[PDB]
Amino acid sequence: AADRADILYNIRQTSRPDVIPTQRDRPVAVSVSLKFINILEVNEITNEVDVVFWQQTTWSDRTLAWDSSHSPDQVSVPISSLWVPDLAAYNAISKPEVLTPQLARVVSDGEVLYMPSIRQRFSCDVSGVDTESGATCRIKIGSWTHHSREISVDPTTENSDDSEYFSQYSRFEILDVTQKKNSVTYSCCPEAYEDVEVSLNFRKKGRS
Amino acid sequence: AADRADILYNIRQTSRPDVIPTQRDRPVAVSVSLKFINILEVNEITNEVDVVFWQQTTWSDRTLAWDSSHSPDQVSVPISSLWVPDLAAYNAISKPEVLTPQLARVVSDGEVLYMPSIRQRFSCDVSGVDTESGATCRIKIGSWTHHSREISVDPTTENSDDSEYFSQYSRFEILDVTQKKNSVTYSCCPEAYEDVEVSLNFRKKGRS
Amino acid sequence: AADRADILYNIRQTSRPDVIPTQRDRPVAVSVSLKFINILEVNEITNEVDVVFWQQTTWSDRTLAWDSSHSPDQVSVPISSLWVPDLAAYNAISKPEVLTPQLARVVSDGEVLYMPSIRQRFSCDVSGVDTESGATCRIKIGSWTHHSREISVDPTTENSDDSEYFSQYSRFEILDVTQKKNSVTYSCCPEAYEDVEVSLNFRKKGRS
Amino acid sequence: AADRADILYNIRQTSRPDVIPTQRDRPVAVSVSLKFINILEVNEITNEVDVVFWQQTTWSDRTLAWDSSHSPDQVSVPISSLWVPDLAAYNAISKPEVLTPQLARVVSDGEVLYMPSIRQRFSCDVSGVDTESGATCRIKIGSWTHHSREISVDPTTENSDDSEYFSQYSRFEILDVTQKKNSVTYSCCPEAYEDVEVSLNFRKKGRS
Amino acid sequence: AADRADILYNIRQTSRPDVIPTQRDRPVAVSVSLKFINILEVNEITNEVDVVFWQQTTWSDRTLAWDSSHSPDQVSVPISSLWVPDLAAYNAISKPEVLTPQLARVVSDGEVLYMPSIRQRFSCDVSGVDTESGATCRIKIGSWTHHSREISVDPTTENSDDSEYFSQYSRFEILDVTQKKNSVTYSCCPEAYEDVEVSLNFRKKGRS
Numbered sequence A, B, C, D, E: 001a002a003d004r005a006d007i008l009y010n011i012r013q014t015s016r017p018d019v020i021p022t023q024r025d026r027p028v029a030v031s032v033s034l035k036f037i038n039i040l041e042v043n044e045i046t047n048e049v050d051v052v053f054w055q056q057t058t059w060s061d062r063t064l065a066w067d068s069s070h071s072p073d074q075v076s077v078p079i080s081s082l083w084v085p086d087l088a089a090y091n092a093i094s095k096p097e098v099l100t101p102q103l104a105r106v107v108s109d110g111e112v113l114y115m116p117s118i119r120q121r122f123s124c125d126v127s128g129v130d131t132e133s134g135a136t137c138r139i140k141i142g143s144w145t146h147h148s149r150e151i152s153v154d155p156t157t158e159n160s161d162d163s164e165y166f167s168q169y170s171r172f173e174i175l176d177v178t179q180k181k182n183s184v185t186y187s188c189c190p191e192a193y194e195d196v197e198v199s200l201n202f203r204k205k206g207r208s
């Protein structure tokens, strides 16, 4: 009869925060979805935008699974005690500013969810933000050091209201957000690196 | 009997900072209460405010309980030695800047009080701030990863002077502050997350 | 004899940085005095000031005492190795920017001295800063979690020249500084908290 | 027949982060290559630029080698666990801001690859940035404390688009980039510190 | 013979980062020399300047000495493994932004050198910066907690051009640098603290 103190204790034993949990010989499947919450400073001259969003991130780590028959099925764990994808926004020009406690949710079957609220500035296409069609800023997120055979990233395919959580007090409004996937092979290495491109179509409110 | 050294030593032995102190199978009852100290910046156009407040937070942790029979009934302890509610302001657009020493007060009975002074920026309704009826900025604070069955949040209905500790030198003045309990559900999970909605009715000071 | 290394080793053995060193069952007498070095960014419209000052702090911790008959009677020690009063400036709107090496000076009898040069911004009365009588900004500094029975704060009775170390290059000049003691009771607790009130009377320099 | 866990373990076990991994008695051969991603802010009056670039850095540490016949021959490793070249931009006027996860890639032969995306400000010739011939900002990168006998610096001679990864939304465009091997010496001593001079020839984009 | 790893281990096993390396009861003789690299933000209205310099620091700890007849004569060591002078710029109004890897150089005879490149804002006489005679900004640096009998600082009146490494791209030029020494007693203690005062004579570069 283990409690929550036991679950965390035995997770610290099996978990290796620096060892990607590749099962057999397959890549770790990381799903990523960006819940846009706000759009702050926007500079059409420099093509920069300050965005706030909840980066819903999920994956499975079997080395964490336990028996939930006489124990809770889920627990909150500091991410510093788990392995986490080394995701990076390729066109970000400031490091990600995490606004929420850095805790992930771990399910007895090894499923992991981490959804930090992040504030980050980006280099993207802002032109057209003050027009009916709006501007389309594309955000590219993917593993920085794990190629396609170690980590694959796919947008959590779930038809959701693009502005379900978007602040109603923002000067901007979201016209549409589309998430796509891509595989790129750089110089350094022969293997491909997967990324997800989130396109944020938005414009200023109250235009003539 | 014992001294402050023993109390902290003991807290050190039984305290589990990363384990939510749920006694039995019910949620930890956390009380939240904001005391507004200042309103530094307000933007009528972007609907943004920069404020300073004391986030009075209390909860119970049985494991820390000790007999004050012949020793102090209270000690100041670094929050890094205790478990703390993973509270977050859902509409905040900046990381919380804790202006005070990160020490919590622990009562011999396991009661915990943590009151950090915090400066933080929020996205909220600033319209009407320049009028007699002022503006109403609602700030939502609740656990980030613990749903209703693990954490409950309720305000401290201590009907006091909303501007009791408010700075007299601020450019704004407080008209009224009300704290309402609120529940919310999201995608990830079926169970809802509780939060305390703080309505700050304030306006600019002056004639006209 | 004994060397500075021995002194530091033993200090580290007896020092309980997280335990207030109360003698008998009395409060630790903490002396606080400010030496103003500069006045940087004044704003009479927002009633905010950016100030640089030396926070001369002294207290006693007998549990760090040693025999200096054949050894040195003083050593510099990192503050992390010592218990330090959890002092806070009640009307500060930015956390303190400690500009100096965080080392405290310890005497063999247990007297501790810690004097960091601090740059911090405050919310205070800036009205009249550009008039002959200048403005009077009052700074309140005291323990954040230790009430009167645990910590007592008193302004060092000394009387250095108010602007003896104040930069001659500031746009402003000090007209007078008075540091008075004070006590305050809150909503959380029946026992009061002590604080020193420092009144900085200053003005922008004239011309001719 | 060892998995990634054993590999990383071994690496954390034999790696000496503070000891230069000198093979026999020849300097450590470090290769440095900059891949400009953006030119954020430019000032022709103060000869100062703000640029983002991927700093491709490679070297060898034979002690980390492991038999990958029946095991992975490449793992991601926290640079904190490894010895890393103490490279510095000699004409940088700001601390390098690493925007990406600080992980290096280690091959089973001891080859170490580290490519952090960095944002940093430099003091360099910006004159002509607004002409068809644009400006030429030269950035010097080399070891800060290891002269030529301890560390050698060489540009990863690899033909490729000078702006293959440069932002298309930037306000500037890259005309050419030449990375030349070179060295620096100081009065005091005969010691010679090798570096890589990266010539960034760019100009303001024409709105046409 | 001994390799670099053996040299480090010996250093780590005898150097005491928190213990000043005093000889008998003689004060540690520290050498300070500033090599200006740039003069960035300059404000004659507020008398503030942003300066980038190499803070060449020298001292010795003979207990770290080894035989280099058949072993390296020098090694780079993280300053966190060494005792380092607690130097502070008295008229600095910003904490130092260390731009270079924080590694020192220890020589086999016990000498230790540390040359961090630093950017710091100073409060000093900026008046006359736009004239032929320019301005004279005096920078004062010395130990913060070690008086004259524990540490003595001396300006290396070595032969070297003032703007030998000074940037050509700065909006200013150096006219003459002179280093003097001083000793001061403060309202806290009886013993005096030494310091080196650097007078930087610079002016706005003009086509005259």
Ligand SMILES: O=[N+]([O-])/C=C1\NCCN1Cc1ccc(Cl)nc1
Residues within 6 Å of the ligand: A054, A103, A104, A105, A113, A114, A115, A116, B144, B145, B186, B187, B188, B189, B193
């Ligand atoms: O949108 N969601 O699915 C969920 C949430 N949005 C804001 C807080 N929230 C709850 C939550 C659940 C799991 C984790 Cl790891 N972090 C936060």
Ligand SMILES: O=[N+]([O-])/C=C1\NCCN1Cc1ccc(Cl)nc1
Residues within 6 Å of the ligand: B054, B103, B104, B105, B113, B114, B115, B116, C144, C145, C186, C187, C188, C189, C193
């Ligand atoms: O408002 N209050 O109830 C109490 C306080 N306000 C400012 C300092 N203060 C004292 C205090 C007590 C306990 C804790 Cl945990 N922190 C601060």
Ligand SMILES: O=[N+]([O-])/C=C1\NCCN1Cc1ccc(Cl)nc1
Residues within 6 Å of the ligand: A143, A144, A145, A186, A187, A188, A189, A193, D035, D054, D056, D103, D104, D105, D113, D114, D115, D116
């Ligand atoms: O540009 N490149 O050559 C390579 C890359 N650019 C972005 C991610 N990427 C992959 C990568 C591989 C190993 C390391 Cl150490 N860092 C990054």
Ligand SMILES: O=[N+]([O-])/C=C1\NCCN1Cc1ccc(Cl)nc1
Residues within 6 Å of the ligand: D144, D145, D186, D187, D188, D189, E054, E103, E104, E105, E113, E114, E115, E116
């Ligand atoms: O001026 N010098 O003699 C030497 C140097 N100036 C800038 C870097 N540099 C090399 C150097 C030497 C010793 C140390 Cl400890 N750090 C850097």
Ligand SMILES: O=[N+]([O-])/C=C1\NCCN1Cc1ccc(Cl)nc1
Residues within 6 Å of the ligand: C035, C054, C056, C103, C104, C105, C113, C114, C115, C116, E144, E145, E186, E187, E188, E189, E193
């Ligand atoms: O003003 N004073 O009394 C003393 C000082 N002012 C600047 C440096 N200084 C010396 C000093 C002594 C002890 C400690 Cl703990 N810190 C600084």
